Write a protein that binds this DNA or RNA. Sequence first.
RNA 1: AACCCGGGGA
RNA 2: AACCCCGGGC
Lengths: 186, 182
Amino acid sequence: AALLTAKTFSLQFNNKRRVNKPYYPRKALLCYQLTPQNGSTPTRGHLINKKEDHAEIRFINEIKSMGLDETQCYQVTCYLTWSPCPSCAGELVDFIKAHRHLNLRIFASRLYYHWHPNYQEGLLLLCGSQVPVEVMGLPEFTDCWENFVDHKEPPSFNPSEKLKELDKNSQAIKRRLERIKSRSVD
Amino acid sequence: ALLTAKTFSLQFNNKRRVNKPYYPRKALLCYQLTPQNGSTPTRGHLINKKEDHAEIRFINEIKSMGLDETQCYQVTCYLTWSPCPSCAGELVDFIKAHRHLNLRIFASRLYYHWHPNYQEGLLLLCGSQVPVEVMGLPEFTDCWENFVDHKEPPSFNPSEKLKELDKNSQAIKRRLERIKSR
RNA sequence: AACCCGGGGA
RNA sequence: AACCCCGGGC
Ligand SMILES: [Zn+2]
Ligand SMILES: [Zn+2]
């Protein structure tokens, strides 16, 4: 269970506004990439659980379990299917502020409760704390398909058609996040 | 039997989508049988079965009454969902063989109105002397007064509830008129 | 099936 | 929770 199946990628990163029939849960999925600055081999992994749970907290404890050398500098890229809840946003900020040897970027497929003010404040808290939050587009969806999906078996769908579909649906989501960031600068 | 005020509100709910918490909006049929000579009108309500829709049960219920076929009757049906094509065909065959009945159908919501076969069923009814219209403020009020139990007071304001149902009906009336173009 | 509102469906 | 597509949410 190291890499994701092509089916899991399609179903969980699905960024349509509404799940189609037959309905299935779009769970919280986190794909992370740890890239040391000195050029060591990057470490990759993913964690999945129900959206009500907190994959970001599991991600924090997974980073701590690696026993990283704090004299090195690390660039961390996180691909989320759902953007973080407000409590996880605060925990990520506190974690990154105490571990300044880590540089964290967050890419989200969907914006979790983006109409709710507390969830908006959580995303703004991350951006204001040197944790950039952006919406996944074609480059991010492609980078996730190449590095986190099992390619030994071909997918049932066309990978080029799926990535173009995900990028097309991302336009309205990127548009929504900029309206959130514009409202803070009032 | 009568409908509770809660059942009327929930089952005739004509919003585009059920709000949270979700509940099934199932097929409900309220009928009124009014003889021409002025006899006491007959009322009742019917719910789908696992194999018989409410319209088919309604057809069989009318036949079971042993109506005098030399009289004439006005029949009004308030439906929460508009008829499926199979029920539409059965209603037409029933009304053509029972010309002592005049049938009008009012629907709160249009059942699968984007499907061409379901549209043909509604047009078949209209073309077979069974006018199909969308329920508005008069129909919701007439159904509320004649089919709801008024012994127990509702938790909501009945006048406010009927205004909401009529407001939601405008987009549905609009949709049925687009269908009525051959 | 994260939530609401609005429009449409040859 | 009838379906699909689109737009928006101090
Ligand atoms: Zn969380
Ligand atoms: Zn039917």
